[PDB]
């Protein structure tokens, strides 16, 4: 699988505790929170 | 499988707490919270 | 798996405590909380 | 798998404290918080 | 795996305390917490 | 008025993210959140 | 307003992030958020 | 107003980011986040 | 007001980062965050 | 206004940053973050 020519903004004004996962862009693999 | 030309833009102005995931584009892969 | 011509602009204006993970762009792997 | 061409902008304005793992770019491998 | 062709940008204006990892970039290896 | 002889147990387990007031035992004046 | 002869236990086990106010015991006064 | 006689025993497991005010006992005055 | 005879355990593990208050006891005054 | 008598504990095992106060006891006063 091939992925390309992508425009990505991703903002994150405020987050009070995170216990898993923050991704922007994720093409392939595992995440586990 | 393949993916190109997005334009993509995410907004998180305010999470309490989050135990899972949080994804702007996944193309694949395997997400557990 | 290719991946290439990407423009990613990351934004993280607050955050209180992160257990997890914050990732603006992953192609692949493995990541757990 | 190849990864090039890519252009990348990260902002972290103010982070308490992180336990875990904050990642600009992550083509492979295994982060484990 | 290749990596080229790249350009980063990454910023830390304000941190508390990591006790964990802050990798700008990573083509590959394990990084634990 | 007046407030005596009392037992009082809080457990507050997990909370996300509180915008307002927590508040154990309140005998009087006036809380705004 | 007397208040005497209180016995409190107060538990805060994990909090995201508190934006107003976490109070054991107030007997008067004005708590703003 | 008095206060006395007063057995208090806080805890504060994990916080992640406290922008308002913590407190265990307030017999008055005012507290603004 | 008087305050006396008081018994007081404050107990504070870990905080990520504090832009407030932390107070054990308060009998009065004002604090602003 | 006046305060006598009084048993205080204080523990901060663990804090990344603060900007604003950690105050034990205040019987008075203005405090500032």
Not at 2 to 14: C, I, N, P, R, T
Not at 18 to 30: F, P, Q, R, T
């Amino acid at each position: 699988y091939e992925v390309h020519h992508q425009k990505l903004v991703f903002f994150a004004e405020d987050v009070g505790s995170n216990k898993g996962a923050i991704i922007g862009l994720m093409v392939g693999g595992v995440v586990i929170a």
